[PDB]
Amino acid sequence: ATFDILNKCTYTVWAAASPGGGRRLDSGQSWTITVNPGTTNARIWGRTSCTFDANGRGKCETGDCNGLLECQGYGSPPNTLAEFALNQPNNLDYIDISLVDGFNIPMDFSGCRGIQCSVDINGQCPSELKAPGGCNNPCTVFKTNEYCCTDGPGSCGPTTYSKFFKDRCPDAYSYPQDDKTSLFTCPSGTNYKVTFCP
């Protein structure tokens, strides 16, 4: 599948992908990548307030991936995520926006349907969850089963903190087991667009 990733934010977003790497996107810029069928565990995000040297090493305020421009692994929360797994059984791609590793930049993820989390989550973030440049999920910050769902299927459910996210972005995962209303599929062969600040 192809992914067009577009920055419509008024500020530079250093886009990142696992797998795929990373690119500086100033306002209005785009980066198109191919992710092969069968890839699972994949994600596209944006990073704010980065600084990189001529070799691409440095540090981002949000979403930092081991201090590289061209990521080779996941970023540090808080980071809004476009998650996907391609060509799964019955020729299905499974897509979602997740807030389980936090929020940093508003996002639209579109394929056979549009998913969008665009409200001002940073401006409204509870003080328990605030981070520089974003809003953490309570699971990242408070490590208990109530928010992290480690104790098995059905052992957790929505909390006051996850409802903060879900009330604002009903279609994105707000806690780890938030699948019924956050996990979507498209037919394999669909191509995708991820847009920052839609």
Author numbering: 25 to 222
What sentences appear in the manuscript?
Despite these low concentrations, proteins have a great technological relevance in winemaking as some of them, the grape pathogenesis-related (PR) proteins, can aggregate to form a visible haze. Among the grape PR-proteins, the thaumatin-like proteins (TLPs) and chitinases can undergo changes in structural integrity, particularly under certain conditions such as when wines are exposed to elevated temperatures during storage or transportation. In this paper the crystal structure and some physico-chemical parameters relevant for the haze formation mechanism of three isoforms of TLPs isolated from grape juice were determined. Plant TLPs generally have three domains and a cleft located between domains I and II.
